[PDB]
Motif scaffolding. Structure first.
Motif, PDB file in Angstrom:
ATOM      1  N   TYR E  15       0.964  -1.153   0.329  1.00 29.06           N
ATOM      2  CA  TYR E  15      -0.069   0.031   0.020  1.00 29.06           C
ATOM      3  C   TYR E  15       1.130   1.328  -0.145  1.00 29.06           C
ATOM      4  O   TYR E  15       1.933   1.493   0.937  1.00 29.06           O
ATOM      5  CB  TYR E  15      -0.674   0.045   1.085  1.00 29.06           C
ATOM      6  CG  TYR E  15      -2.223  -1.035   1.155  1.00 29.06           C
ATOM      7  CD1 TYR E  15      -2.287  -1.928   0.441  1.00 29.06           C
ATOM      8  CD2 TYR E  15      -2.099  -1.788   2.425  1.00 29.06           C
ATOM      9  CE1 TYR E  15      -4.007  -2.450   0.238  1.00 29.06           C
ATOM     10  CE2 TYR E  15      -3.052  -2.553   2.254  1.00 29.06           C
ATOM     11  CZ  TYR E  15      -3.296  -3.525   1.439  1.00 29.06           C
ATOM     12  OH  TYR E  15      -4.523  -4.469   1.042  1.00 29.06           O
ATOM     13  N   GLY E  16       0.963   1.935  -0.505  1.00 30.34           N
ATOM     14  CA  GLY E  16       1.589   3.233  -1.040  1.00 30.34           C
ATOM     15  C   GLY E  16       2.584   2.989  -1.505  1.00 30.34           C
ATOM     16  O   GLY E  16       3.181   4.904  -2.072  1.00 30.34           O
ATOM     17  N   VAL E  17       3.349   2.108  -1.544  1.00 39.21           N
ATOM     18  CA  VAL E  17       4.542   1.890  -2.513  1.00 39.21           C
ATOM     19  C   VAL E  17       4.462   0.811  -3.662  1.00 39.21           C
ATOM     20  O   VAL E  17       4.278   0.014  -2.509  1.00 39.21           O
ATOM     21  CB  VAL E  17       5.239   1.928  -1.789  1.00 39.21           C
ATOM     22  CG1 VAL E  17       6.173   2.741  -0.970  1.00 39.21           C
ATOM     23  CG2 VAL E  17       5.667   0.945  -0.440  1.00 39.21           C
ATOM     24  N   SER E  18       4.822   1.092  -4.330  1.00 45.50           N
ATOM     25  CA  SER E  18       4.690  -0.224  -5.532  1.00 45.50           C
ATOM     26  C   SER E  18       6.231  -1.274  -4.815  1.00 45.50           C
ATOM     27  O   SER E  18       7.259  -0.617  -4.811  1.00 45.50           O
ATOM     28  CB  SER E  18       5.527  -0.206  -7.239  1.00 45.50           C
ATOM     29  OG  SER E  18       6.855   1.585  -7.156  1.00 45.50           O
ATOM     30  N   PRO E  19       6.403  -2.302  -5.183  1.00 42.72           N
ATOM     31  CA  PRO E  19       7.292  -3.287  -3.959  1.00 42.72           C
ATOM     32  C   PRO E  19       8.653  -3.251  -5.056  1.00 42.72           C
ATOM     33  O   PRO E  19       8.965  -3.324  -3.619  1.00 42.72           O
ATOM     34  CB  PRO E  19       7.037  -4.705  -4.309  1.00 42.72           C
ATOM     35  CG  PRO E  19       5.896  -4.490  -5.242  1.00 42.72           C
ATOM     36  CD  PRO E  19       5.277  -3.279  -5.847  1.00 42.72           C
ATOM     37  N   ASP E  63      -4.957   5.418   7.759  1.00 47.58           N
ATOM     38  CA  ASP E  63      -3.550   5.426   7.103  1.00 47.58           C
ATOM     39  C   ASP E  63      -2.627   5.780   6.122  1.00 47.58           C
ATOM     40  O   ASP E  63      -3.146   4.503   6.295  1.00 47.58           O
ATOM     41  CB  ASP E  63      -2.960   6.806   8.180  1.00 47.58           C
ATOM     42  CG  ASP E  63      -1.951   7.838   7.946  1.00 47.58           C
ATOM     43  OD1 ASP E  63      -1.869   8.001   7.271  1.00 47.58           O
ATOM     44  OD2 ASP E  63      -2.476   9.056   8.926  1.00 47.58           O
ATOM     45  N   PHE E  64      -1.269   6.074   5.826  1.00 52.12           N
ATOM     46  CA  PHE E  64      -0.719   5.279   4.962  1.00 52.12           C
ATOM     47  C   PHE E  64      -0.301   3.180   6.333  1.00 52.12           C
ATOM     48  O   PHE E  64      -0.500   3.561   7.254  1.00 52.12           O
ATOM     49  CB  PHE E  64      -0.029   5.711   5.532  1.00 52.12           C
ATOM     50  CG  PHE E  64       1.515   5.043   4.235  1.00 52.12           C
ATOM     51  CD1 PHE E  64       1.930   4.175   3.266  1.00 52.12           C
ATOM     52  CD2 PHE E  64       2.632   4.594   5.293  1.00 52.12           C
ATOM     53  CE1 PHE E  64       3.424   3.937   2.883  1.00 52.12           C
ATOM     54  CE2 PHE E  64       3.784   3.223   4.753  1.00 52.12           C
ATOM     55  CZ  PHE E  64       4.027   3.631   3.432  1.00 52.12           C
ATOM     56  N   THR E  65      -0.066   2.628   5.060  1.00 48.29           N
ATOM     57  CA  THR E  65       0.330   1.584   5.669  1.00 48.29           C
ATOM     58  C   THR E  65       1.066   0.934   5.033  1.00 48.29           C
ATOM     59  O   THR E  65       1.012   0.910   3.364  1.00 48.29           O
ATOM     60  CB  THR E  65      -1.348   0.774   5.478  1.00 48.29           C
ATOM     61  OG1 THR E  65      -2.032   0.607   6.772  1.00 48.29           O
ATOM     62  CG2 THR E  65      -0.501  -0.944   6.508  1.00 48.29           C
ATOM     63  N   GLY E  66       1.736  -0.488   5.441  1.00 51.85           N
ATOM     64  CA  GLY E  66       3.649  -0.626   4.300  1.00 51.85           C
ATOM     65  C   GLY E  66       2.600  -1.689   3.202  1.00 51.85           C
ATOM     66  O   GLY E  66       1.793  -1.667   2.889  1.00 51.85           O
ATOM     67  N   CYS E  67       2.981  -2.987   3.638  1.00 52.93           N
ATOM     68  CA  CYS E  67       3.396  -4.249   2.900  1.00 52.93           C
ATOM     69  C   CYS E  67       2.747  -5.426   3.625  1.00 52.93           C
ATOM     70  O   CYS E  67       3.597  -5.851   4.441  1.00 52.93           O
ATOM     71  CB  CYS E  67       4.873  -4.481   2.245  1.00 52.93           C
ATOM     72  SG  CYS E  67       5.537  -3.136   0.886  1.00 52.93           S
ATOM     73  N   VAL E  68       1.634  -6.028   3.694  1.00 53.57           N
ATOM     74  CA  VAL E  68       1.229  -6.957   4.771  1.00 53.57           C
ATOM     75  C   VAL E  68       1.698  -8.224   3.610  1.00 53.57           C
ATOM     76  O   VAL E  68       1.384  -8.481   2.303  1.00 53.57           O
ATOM     77  CB  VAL E  68      -0.157  -6.766   4.518  1.00 53.57           C
ATOM     78  CG1 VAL E  68      -1.013  -6.472   3.357  1.00 53.57           C
ATOM     79  CG2 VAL E  68      -0.998  -8.203   5.499  1.00 53.57           C
TER      80      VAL E  68
END
Lengths: 150, 50, 219, 221, 100
Positions: E15-19, E63-68
């Motif tokens: 989420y919010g960043v391409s891997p 809010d922002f979340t990283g990678c699950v």
């Protein structure tokens, strides 16, 4: 004279050349581009903008010269059992350049996927439809727009 | 996140073999320029870089 | 609110060939996940709704594997590979992205069959209604197709209207047949004037109109 | 397996509280949301709201001002209370098991259903009239017969034959509304008539609001 | 890259960043939450759903979340007895706060 004197057109604003001085010009070539956009994001047609449709399906250069004209035409498109005539692609692909007109309808998505079908979880079908069936929406009415040039 | 303090976590940086006596585009720890590289006899103090 | 639409509203399908029903949405149906939430229910006549598809691509337990769905965004499609005698009902599509969750209008699926000759019967009133204040005579129509028909009551060779009502049943799930009945109401005072009563039945599969009558005065 | 079931009054006066109860049997306490749903006559279905086991709930904005719902773990029952109702709320109510909790909405199980009517009018008892077969009721080797019920209010009525032993050829037509204001309905059964004379014909008529149980006898001639 | 290229991960959503660009833009501090849940119950871990874990257990914010990340782990959790040591919360009286 008639086009600017015409009040039937909702929006007529443009730059590069002032509209009042258009009666004394002899430019080489004239381009007539016309398409259909929802009543929202109409201002995105202007160059140097950024948006879902502007950066993706019709981009104008910053060195643009010409005019943009838009008028409401909701009298013969809506108030029926759906419209389903004017498709578009969503927020995908890898952005646009001014004046490409590229149609390469295909299925693609990140996630190390094959190409077999829709498969909601991994891939999507890029294009979907507009909806103007509700009478509601100032920015949802089926507006029509043209863009001239010089 | 990345909006509380100066970045202290960084990704790995790769390195390339260095060449000598040839016109190249060098990049030493963020220092950029063009020229040729040759051995020297300077006496840099241990805490100095360039 | 977001409103569901389907196309068409009625659909006649012969057994054997695949069919399709479409349910179009008004807003994009795709949550923060890669999933798109949708449902497809099936209400047989006289029963309670059941679940067939949820998440638009995963079947439910015990459902025969003939139903399937596809699509994403605002377009979805359900198909039935081979329709059967028990697939008579009304289909709905539900959205569940956010509160509230509302259904659609409801597609009606119709099953087709070879025309069969209707059977007719007449019910003379008995003495209980003859003493209760109102006499009623009922004409019976059974196991006919199509439902398209129209009846008259001929009392002493005189047309009657405005005082009769007809009842229709939803198509049976075992033989795909329609049944109809007609009711006529009349008081005691004007009842003791006529002698012969009958009901008229006309059907597409019948070569000629059929008239069945009875005379008052025989048990 | 779970088998839901409703129970409650059928006729309610205008601007009066409405109370029902969807008892749950079999699968007991668990982490499952429960909802309610209704259906106007001859229209679409309308979902109302859902309640959790603990008690947290969310409501439909349209009906968030005069509706309440609770739960009771000991009796495995949850109830719906609707107050100041109008005639527009006359419908059939189903209680679900999955709940459309804006996440997936899998309606895994549905109830049998209960019909409620909103009126200041009273409740009335029917008058069953047998449909005796006659000579004109037979065309060849097949004869038809049934029962007629008249002057009953409110809906619905359940009709059975031979205590459920006769399930072939049974038919119950939908009720009709008379001008006088009293509903009417009749049922007829078709049989391959070859044993008339000794077979007993009994139509099982019930009316829960007016607790009227009658088994009328129908005989030829 | 070692975790991204591995094929043992059934699901990997960011989420919010391409891997493949996280090695470029570097963030100051990260977090590593961990727990054990079902297979069909994985999807409640997302920004703003409503279930048994998104309301009463570890719940993500809007809010922002990283990678699950998730994967199948039936190899070392098996056998007749069943790992009853696992437990979850199913009788909470009210909603939670992000990272309660």
């Amino acid at each position: 004279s008639v086009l600017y004197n015409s009040a039937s057109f909702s929006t007529f604003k443009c730059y590069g050349v002032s509209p009042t001085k258009l009666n004394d010009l002899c430019f080489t070539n004239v381009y007539a581009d016309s398409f259909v956009i929802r009543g929202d994001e109409v201002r995105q047609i202007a160059p140097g903008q950024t948006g879902k449709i502007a950066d993706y399906n019709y981009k104008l250069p910053d060195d643009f010269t010409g005019c943009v004209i838009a008028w409401n035409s909701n009298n013969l498109d809506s108030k029926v059992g759906g419209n389903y005539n004017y498709l578009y692609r969503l927020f995908r692909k890898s952005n646009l350049k001014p004046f490409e007109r590229d149609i390469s309808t295909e299925i693609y998505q990140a996630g190390s996927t094959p190409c077999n079908g829709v498969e909601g979880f991994n891939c999507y079908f890029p294009l979907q439809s507009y909806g103007f069936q509700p009478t509601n929406g100032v920015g949802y009415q089926p507006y029509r727009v043209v863009v001239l040039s010089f | 996140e990345l909006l509380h303090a100066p970045a202290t976590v960084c990704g790995p940086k790769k390195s390339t073999n260095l060449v000598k006596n040839k016109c190249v585009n060098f990049n030493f720890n963020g220092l950029t320029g063009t020229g040729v590289l040759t051995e020297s006899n300077k006496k840099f103090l241990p805490f100095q870089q360039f | 609110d977001i409103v569901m639409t389907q196309s068409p509203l009625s659909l006649p399908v012969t057994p054997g060939e695949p069919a399709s029903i479409s349910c179009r949405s008004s807003q994009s149906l795709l949550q923060n996940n890669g999933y798109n939430y949708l449902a497809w229910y099936l209400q047989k006549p006289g029963q309670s709704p059941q679940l067939l598809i949820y998440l638009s691509s995963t079947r439910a337990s015990g459902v025969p594997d003939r139903f399937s769905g596809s699509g994403s965004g605002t377009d979805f499609t359900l198909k039935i590979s081979r329709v059967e005698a028990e697939d008579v009902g009304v289909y709905y599509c539900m959205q569940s992205l956010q509160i509230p969750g509302t259904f659609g209008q409801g597609t009606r699926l119709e099953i087709k069959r070879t025309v069969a000759a209707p059977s007719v019967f007449i019910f003379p009133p008995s003495d209980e209604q003859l003493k209760s204040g109102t006499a009623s005579v009922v004409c019976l129509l059974n196991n006919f197709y199509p439902r398209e028909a129209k009846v008259q009551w001929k009392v002493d060779n005189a047309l009657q209207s405005g005082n009769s009502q007809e009842s229709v049943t939803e198509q049976d799930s075992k033989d795909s047949t329609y049944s109809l009945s007609s009711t006529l109401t009349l008081s005691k005072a004007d009842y003791e004037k006529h002698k012969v009563y009958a009901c008229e039945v006309t059907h597409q599969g019948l070569s000629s109109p059929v008239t069945k009558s009875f005379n008052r005065g025989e048990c | 397996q779970v088998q839901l079931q409703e129970s409650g009054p059928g006729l309610v006066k205008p601007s009066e509280t409405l109370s029902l109860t969807c008892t749950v049997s079999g699968g007991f306490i668990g982490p499952h949301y429960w909802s309610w749903v209704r259906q106007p006559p001859g229209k679409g279905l309308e979902w109302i709201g859902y309640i959790y086991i603990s008690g947290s709930t969310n409501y439909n904005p349209s009906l968030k001002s005069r509706l309440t719902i609770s739960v009771d773990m000991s009796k495995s029952q949850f109830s719906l209370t609707l107050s100041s109702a109008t005639a527009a709320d006359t419908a059939v109510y189903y209680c679900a098991r999955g709940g459309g909790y804006l996440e997936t909405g899998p309606f895994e199980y549905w109830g049998q259903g209960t019909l409620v009517t909103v009126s200041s009018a009273s409740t009335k008892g029917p008058s069953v009239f047998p449909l005796a077969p006659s000579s004109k009721s037979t065309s060849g080797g097949t004869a038809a017969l049934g029962c007629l019920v008249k002057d009953y209010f409110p809906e619905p009525v359940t009709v059975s034959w031979n205590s459920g032993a006769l399930t072939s050829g049974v038919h119950t037509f939908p009720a009709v509304l008379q001008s006088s204001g009293l509903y009417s309905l009749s049922s007829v059964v078709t049989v391959p008539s070859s044993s008339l004379g000794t077979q007993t014909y009994i139509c099982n008529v019930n009316h829960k609001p007016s607790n009227t149980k009658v088994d009328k006898r129908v005989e030829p001639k």
